[PDB]
Each structure stands twice: as structure tokens, then as C-alpha cells.
Structure 1
Amino acid sequence: ISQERKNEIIKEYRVHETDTGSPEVQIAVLTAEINAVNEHLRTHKKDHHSRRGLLKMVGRRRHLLNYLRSKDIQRYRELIKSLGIR
């Protein structure tokens, strides 16, 4: 995604101002990246190399989600319902 869209997403999902490393911010940006790569792959089906990075992003988001669900169930539920990633 563009740095502008990334800035918009981090502004939207940041827990507080100046927050860029929160699980919410990271997983929202990862959701955007995953969707963009999925849209790319839909046209360029045979781009296995890109799809591999996509899967790395998916696993990173999964681990962030596991950590967030372990730390704060309510935050996890709110975030997943906000992002539509369940």
C-alpha cells in the first residue's frame, strides 16, 4: 500500500497518538497489505514468489492476533469485528 494509505490506517487504528507499534495498528496494516496482494494475485495467478510474502504476512498477523487475544479479549473481539477478518 502507499505510505499515505498506511498513514491513514495507522491514524485510524492507533491506540493513542504517536502509536505505530500497537498490535491493532500492525494487524490493520497487515490486513490492508494482504488484501492488496490478494487483488494482485487474482490477476497474476502464477506469481508464487509474491504469494509467499503474502503468506508470511498472514502468519505474522495470526501471531499478533494470538498475542492480542491472550492479553485482552475485548480488544481482540473489537479489532476483528472492526476489520472483518474472522
Structure 2
Amino acid sequence: ISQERKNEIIKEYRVHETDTGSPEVQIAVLTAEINAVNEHLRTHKKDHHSRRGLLKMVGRRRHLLNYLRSKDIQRYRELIKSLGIR
């Protein structure tokens, strides 16, 4: 995804100004990137190498979503409805 679009996503989900590392920001950007590669894979179904990157991104999102639910369930519930992930 473009740095412009990424920056827009950070601003939408940043917990505080200057926040770039919160699970919310990281999950949101990951969600965008997963969708973009899923789009690539629809046209290019035999780009196995790119799909592997997508699999790693899905796992990293899962692990952060696991951590957030563990720490703050409200923050989790708000993030999943906002990003439409479940």
C-alpha cells in the first residue's frame, strides 16, 4: 500500500498522536495490506511466493489481535467491528 494510504490508516486508528506501534495501528495497516495482496492473488493465482508473505501477515495480525483481546477486550471489540474482521 502507498505510504500516503498507510499514513491515513495510522491517523484513523492511532490511539494517541505520534502513536505508530499500538496493536490498533499495526492491525489496521496489516488489514489493508492483506486485502491488497488478496486482490493481487485474484488476478495472479499462481504467485505462490506473494501468498506466503500474505500468510505471514495474517499470522502477525492474529498474534496482535490475540494480545489485544488479552489486554483490553473493549479495545479489541471496537477494532474488529471498525475493521470488519471476524
Q: What is the alpha-carbon distance in structure 1 between the residues aligned to residue 27 and residue 55 of structure 2?
A: 14
Cα distance in structure 2, aligned partners of 1:74 and 1:8: 23
Deviations for 1:32-81, whole angstroms, at most 9, x for unmatched residues?
00000000000000000000000000000000000000000000000000
Aligned residues: 86
- Could you tell me how far apart the structure 2 residues matched to 1:52 and 1:38 are? 11
What's the offset of the Cα at 1:6? 0.3
CA-CA distance at 1:2 after TM superposition: 0.2
RMSD: 0.2
TM-score (norm 1): 0.99
Sequence identity percentage = 100
TM superposition outliers: structure 1 runs of 4+ over 6 Å: none
Map 1:38-49; keep pairs closer than 5 Å.
38-49=38-49
Cα separation, 2, equivalents of 1:35 and 1:69: 22
Gap regions ≥5 residues in structure 2: none
Deviation at 1:83, TM superposition (A): 0.3
Unpaired segments ≥5 residues, structure 1: none
Paired residue for 1:54? 54
